[PDB]
Design a protein around this ligand. Structure first.
Ligand SMILES: CCCCCC(=O)SCCNC(=O)CCNC(=O)[C@H](O)C(C)(C)COP(=O)(O)OP(=O)(O)OC[C@H]1O[C@@H](n2cnc3c(N)ncnc32)[C@H](O)[C@@H]1OP(=O)(O)O
Ligand SMILES: CCCCCC(=O)SCCNC(=O)CCNC(=O)[C@H](O)C(C)(C)COP(=O)(O)OP(=O)(O)OC[C@H]1O[C@@H](n2cnc3c(N)ncnc32)[C@H](O)[C@@H]1OP(=O)(O)O
Lengths: 359, 358
């Protein structure tokens, strides 16, 4: 198995959203990942590409034998991932303390939205809920409209799976000097708050307000926003630095002397109207051409179905073909121990086989 | 120094965006982080809480002495972070090959948007540019409007700094076997693409379309979206699973018999009209009460300024106070080697004093 995490052994108790994602990335980077699902759900080779780089086994964890088989896996592993509500693994007899008896070296990684304790800790929830409570969701969207969810990228993945990964891998490093595992408590409401630390920094220096649509990076700034083009497609402009901003104006054909200052916020509506008219006068592809090799920070906004046709994407092999279609290659990339292309979701294998394999 | 990364030594070539965010989190978790800025840059103690858990030092890397003091720090460190365009560290004589000659244990961490090669590798950009090229930005916002940037959360941080962190820490694990460092190439265009791997999976199985605002998780579903309340504030609804959805309906006072099926997408206009009118009939804090302790997946949409009053936030200490504003405590959390509260930004330190200490 190629990648820096060759020889890492991971047991994943099947769940949804962040835990599978973290498991995936571990797998991507060459960890040996064994996913325990319940026999009721698994039937067929799974067509969820998020289950790439896995061995799937079934086991009724509520049975004596299913529990037993699972504790045998965990005894042989470096990391356990679970994404259930607090208390769930404990009642299965798979809680931290039961695991520490069979393996004091285990990294015990708990992925929740609300955390291990506190008043919301038993509430069901999804991404949109976790980001609503800590200020993030309120800050996203246009000012005249209700907030819009940024898919499930910020709570589940950015502020979720990624912090679970950082914790699993930091704990493995700590283990090298201590000889011992420990519990990683990754809550999406926490991770996503660190994810957005820059806004909390800016609010304290009076450089970010709670008004939606009125900030440098939320779409309020005319030089950091999307613009509709003559063909109804979009460009993105991200020209924060005055040098880049100047370059954009020149390529739009706009004389900086006729315009309000870049950062005079009271005249942003006026500046935006001038840029809107300019961008609207040619199609997206025209602007992509005009600004190629430029520091103007103007890029075409591609839909998923167009990404395979973009030279920069193709030539760096950001994607590989599978399946129905394209999927992202592992990230990040490593010079010496490089990841390989992901292995598609495997047939269900028997849990005893795995134990043989793992002695 | 508290936390799981106690003992880890980090050199950070001062940049913007993902690089400092990654360096912050390493510091947050106990790493010993030393940040080399240019002198034509630092003018007192920093106002920027992202530079917490750091020692700051000054050095003209274009001079011979600067270069050599920097190579001395790097010789004694576990990790280097740089987020300049490709070729900047090479031309400075701090490239990977040069560092490899003074410390072959080094994790050499390169944070870019476009990557180390290819047609766009030299173009300036920010978060919005990197997520524009890989399909992400186009998927964010209402169907009746142009795409809206999800702040800089998805390219800079989720798909940038966090992938840099994973790379660094994965390479440290690998170094346990090999006794050798290596280069980590973290590009925002790649990391953000793995961040959205779900949508690429669903797209393949016909469960996600390229039409903005017409999917289960983008605002198209009436049961996964925000709703304006009587007071003009908002709640979030995330009631995907039928049992949570049924719990939401009961709290709203709508009988299921009077509504279209939850997932009959052809009747989503009617369903949205019904939910819209119901949520609009009381204020946000009403709904927050009704649904607390519930599996209805209805939560108040709080503004930054109100977060510090939310019981669940207060009690788990998600935030700490510092310099006229709250900031987030480190994440994730560790049972035995807990992180401590972050140290504020300090006055600059002498690069010699650091080499000594090390
Ligand atoms: C649509 C998805 C994409 C979007 C996802 C997001 O936006 S974020 C993802 C969702 N949020 C989270 O993941 C946060 C943490 N998880 C949760 O809050 C919760 O798991 C949930 C709300 C998602 C779902 O609540 P549920 O009540 O279904 O599940 P819960 O986690 O409480 O308990 C799961 C039950 O399955 C049982 N169980 C698990 N594996 C088993 C196995 N192999 N064999 C037998 N039984 C098994 C456990 O023993 C437990 O039983 P008991 O009944 O005895 O206790
Ligand atoms: C907080 C602001 C916004 C954050 C929100 C976002 O979306 S941020 C995402 C930003 N994008 C990235 O970080 C992606 C990768 N980085 C970049 O593309 C680029 O750094 C950039 C476009 C941000 C900025 O381009 P510039 O052209 O300013 O800088 P570039 O990195 O090419 O070169 C840096 C220059 O500084 C010099 N340099 C750096 N440190 C030095 C030191 N201590 N003493 C002397 N010289 C030093 C280098 O030698 C080089 O100069 P010479 O060329 O003269 O030799």
């Amino acid at each position: 198995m190629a990648g820096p995490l060759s020889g890492l052994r991971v047991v994943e108790l099947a769940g949804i959203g962040p835990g599978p994602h973290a498991a995936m990335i571990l797998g991507d980077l060459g960890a040996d990942v064994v996913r325990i699902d319940r026999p009721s759900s698994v039937d067929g080779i799974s067509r969820d590409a998020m289950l790439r780089n896995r061995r799937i086994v079934t086991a009724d964890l509520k049975s004596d034998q299913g529990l037993e088989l699972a504790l045998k896996l965990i005894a042989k592993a470096d990391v356990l991932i679970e994404g259930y509500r607090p208390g769930v693994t404990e009642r299965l007899g798979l809680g931290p303390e039961e695991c520490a008896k069979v393996n004091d070296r285990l990294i015990y990684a708990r992925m929740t939205g609300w955390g291990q304790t506190g008043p919301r800790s038993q509430q069901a929830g999804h991404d949109i809920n976790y980001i609503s409570l800590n200020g993030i969701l309120h800050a996203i969207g246009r000012g005249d409209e209700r907030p819009v969810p940024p898919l499930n990228l910020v709570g589940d993945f950015g502020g979720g799976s990624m912090f679970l990964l950082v914790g699993i891998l930091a704990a493995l490093w700590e283990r090298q000097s201590s000889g011992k595992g420990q519990v990683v408590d990754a809550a999406m409401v926490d991770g996503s708050s660190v994810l957005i630390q820059m806004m909390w920094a800016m609010r304290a220096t009076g450089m970010w307000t709670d008004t939606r649509g009125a900030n440098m990076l939320d779409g309020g700034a005319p030089y950091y926003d999307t613009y509709e083009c003559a063909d109804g497609r979009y460009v993105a402009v991200g020209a924060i630095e005055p040098q880049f901003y100047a370059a954009m104006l020149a390529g739009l054909g706009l004389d900086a002397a006729e315009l309000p200052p870049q950062n005079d916020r009271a005249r942003w509506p006026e500046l935006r109207a001038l840029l809107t008219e300019a961008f609207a006068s040619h199609d997206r592809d025209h602007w992509g051409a005009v600004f190629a090799n430029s520091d103007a920070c103007v890029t075409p906004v591609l839909a998923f179905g167009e990404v395979h046709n973009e030279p920069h994407i193709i030539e760096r092999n950001t994607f590989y073909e599978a399946n129905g279609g394209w999927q992202p290659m592992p990230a990040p990339r490593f010079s010496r121990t490089a990841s390989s292309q992901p292995r598609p979701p495997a047939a269900t294998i028997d849990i005893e086989a795995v134990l043989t394999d793992w002695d």
